[model samples]
Target chain A: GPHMFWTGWGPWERCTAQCGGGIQARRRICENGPDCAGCNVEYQSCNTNPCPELKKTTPWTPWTPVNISDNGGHYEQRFRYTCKARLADPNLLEVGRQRIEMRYCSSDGTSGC
Target chain B: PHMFWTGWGPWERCTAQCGGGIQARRRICENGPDCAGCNVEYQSCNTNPCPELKKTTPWTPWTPVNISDNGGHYEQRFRYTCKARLADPNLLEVGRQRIEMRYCSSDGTSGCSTGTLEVLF
Candidate 1:
């Protein structure tokens, strides 16, 4: 029986990376000698699931001692967190996350007179 | 006695708003022989309790949330709020909330956004 001049492309090779758009490749061997006209190698994109989002955040700071304000004779307490953050899904950004907890205090040291 | 104190002057304004402020008065010395007693006197005033104190929460970082397209460009809006009320409620309410228009890609992968310097009093 006469053999075909070229072979079908082989299964695609594993993607170079799992995410963020990596290349995958496959090749077929030449059959019926060099006469095989087309190239054997082929490539395609794979695992392009935009790399999973990455996040960065700083730890919250210890609550500062309730500072008694000199003005208006009042007491107020505050606690805070470094709300800064970076989100990367192959992209990066933080719009708002400043964390500060504050409240007014009464003479007895309870919040809100 | 070689020295005597003249009539005391009117009391001065209290040094404090509340919580035992000090008021002072002055008197001249007569026939000074290094005057027998102090020429100035201080008395406690405004012994009433002081009002409670309070403070506002710090400004939160700007948070970008997607909103309907504006003039063919996408937009993000955010606002800041504090625990304590501002001296001027009108200013705080209007100033805290802000919006920005930007050209975000359809997928929101890339874009530009607008940017405030404000303090709470």
Candidate 2:
């Protein structure tokens, strides 16, 4: 057989994308007997496995009137949310979380709490 | 400051389903007040079952050298020596020597498979 020389693949570059689809590249040196001048570097897209889909979910909670509040004299306080949760299994580990919105309407303008 | 089997080491990927896998840890008899175990502790992973890869490349050609030279002593048990020369630096040796060539395997660790002619007269 002809002497086939390959230096083996080099370290891979990061994928073009983290999910969906992406390209990765690696290269190797190659030569034959005499004046061998073929392309040395090589490239191909690789996916170790598919990136997992996001499992987290966040939903909007219904808003209600807590109470009216007044600022210092003619004024009102805007409504907003005050909470968040892990929303993933404890055993699952290192999981991400989703977002949910909460709110209360503007108060009748309370003086102070 | 005594050396002893403290506990198993960290766990990693399993080598199944509701299946049982083999998980292992190491114990050291060092720097401890009291040491118990030494050899690595092997236990079932229990979470899932899998097998470690136990495979290797086939041996190279038998590159035989004639031992039938000592025909008069043919009845005696025989062995031959391989010169400690190799073509490639990164290459490895494996397999048991019959009369000449070597076999191949994964690699050397605490144990090695062959007796270099150095082992014998």
Candidate 3:
């Protein structure tokens, strides 16, 4: 038989993030068990709190040669790398707290560690 | 089950800012074994007056006429504003020589609107 009635939508779920942008969801289900016939999932934006700043990121900066070992082993063949990075105004990502990080590009089949 | 068409979601953020962009809503299927189908649904929004749909209605060329205002060294300046519109009976355009409306679809970006237009007096 065909019977239809809108089940009131369910309560909205908590947003997925603490700040910045995030998403939340709510849904309605058929009173009947999986005895459904159409769309089920409903989604919407949620959580509007302003998140702390995020780390600014850019493409990896140019690679420069550097010493890799305590001995006279200056990386003549190995790879070293750095990426242009910036701190967010409010610094929500904690990246600023970590300070300029060391990034490496693949060279000589190895990463700058 | 016959999941049928219910209603659509509110139009989402204008897919763009200025030049134009679209928004999306949904047409969901029923919530049970009595169902139909689900796909995306898009109608139209501000991005209506796409350039192609614009009224480039060219302005009449300036006639050869000189203003004899005391022949003074005048800085000919006439501040006027205009908004662009299309011919569609259903659509409206509110931009002229403006800003904020940059949408980089080939990439990903959202610009704003340049609320007014520019025209020669």
Which candidate should be chosen as best, given DockQ against the real structure? 3
For model 2, how does the per-residue alpha-carbon lDDT over A1-113 read when each residue is reduced to its tens digit?
A: 67856567689888644533435556666555332333344334454353342221112221211222122111111121112112122222121222222222223333211
lDDT per residue as tens, model 1, B26-64: 888777645544566666687775442222334433221
C-alpha lDDT values of all predictions: 0.40, 0.31, 0.34
Better of 1 and 3 by TM-score: 1
Task: Please provide TM-scores computed only on chain A for all of the candidate models, following their numbering.
Answer: 0.48, 0.32, 0.38
Please write out the lDDT profile of model 3 over residues A23-70, one tens digit for every residue: 566777665444544445555665455433222222221222222222
lDDT winner, 1 or 3: 1
Candidate 3 lDDT, B6-77, residue by residue in tens: 777777776434334445676655654335444454443564433322122122112111221122211111
Clashes of 1: 8
Q: Which stretches of candidate 2 lie over 4 Å from their true place?
A: A1-6, A11-13, A30-36, A48-50, A55-62, A65-113, B1-121
Please provide TM-scores, in order, for all candidate models, with all chains considered together: 0.29, 0.20, 0.26
| lDDT measured at residue B101 in model 3 versus the true structure, 0 to 100 | 19
Q: Relative to the unseen true structure, what is the C-alpha lDDT of residue B90 in candidate 1, on a scale of 0 to 100?
A: 24
DockQ, candidate 3, vs. native dimer: 0.04
Which one wins by TM-score: 1 or 2? 1
